[PDB]
Amino acid sequence: AFYDSIVENYHRDAVRGQAYSLVEKLAPLDQAGRQRQLEDWRPHYGLELSLTDARQAKLTQEEQALLDKNLLVVREDFTEFISRIDAGPQLLDIKLPPEP
Amino acid sequence: MMAFYDSIVENYHRDAVRGQAYSLVEKLAPLDQAGRQRQLEDWRPHYGLELSLTDARQAKLTQEEQALLDKNLLVVREDFTEFISRIDAGPQLLDIKLPPEPSL
Known part of the structure; x- marks a missing residue:
């Protein structure tokens, strides 16, 4: 809808832009390097950060088409954002802070 | 409870x-003035946020807002669309603005 x-x-x-800067540090790192970099960021971030992929995220074909374009997939009433990292399958998941 | x-x-x-401000400040803080300007210029074609440098004079910060900066907390302004962050112990501050909002 509009x-x-x-x-x-x-x-x-x-x-x-936030996703770009996180990906820019994660992309050169291996799987263990990425998990350690996430743990380093968490005490400075109000956002929830994690790694995922199309299967774990149950990405629809339209959502994969966004990732092919290096566009953010938006979920969960505009609070979850999934970003391509590089040419490979592992993706970055970003969640806005929980609401009171 | 809408009073608060x-x-x-x-x-x-x-x-x-x-977190966004922290990652931006981590790159800006070590840099001299030319390096900070360069880094801002490299960031802009990847950012939907507007990024600039300011200080307490040109931002007209209140004492309440300077108190927040002394604690390394974000100053929040303009209908919760502008965020001003301490960079280091110097007077130059980071200004972060959310994307233009849609209009009816």
Whole structure:
């Protein structure tokens, strides 16, 4: 719907730079290096950070098509963001802080 | 309880932006003035946020807001769309603005 598109694109815009900077540090690292880098960030981040992939995330074909374009997949009422990291299958998951 | 509502919204936005600001400051703080400007220019084509440098004079910070910076907490402004962050012990601060909002 039009509301959904505009809000989704806005949050895409608000988070794409954040995702870029996290990916820029994660992409050169191996699997263990990525997990350690996530643990290093967590005491400084209000966002929930984790690694995932299309199977663990149950990505639809439309969502995979976004990742092919290096666009953020937006889920969970505009609070979860999934980013391509590189040419490989492992993805970055970013969640906004929990609400009170 | 709507009487405190602005503190809930402020703390939420501070929580959502504090990590972003930390990662930006980590790159800016070690750099001299030319390096900070260069780094900002390299970031902009990858960011939907507006990124700039400011200080307490040109931001017209209140004492309350300077008190937050002294604690390395984000100053939050402009309908929770602008965030000002301490960079180091110097006067130059980081200004972060969310993307333009849609209009009816």
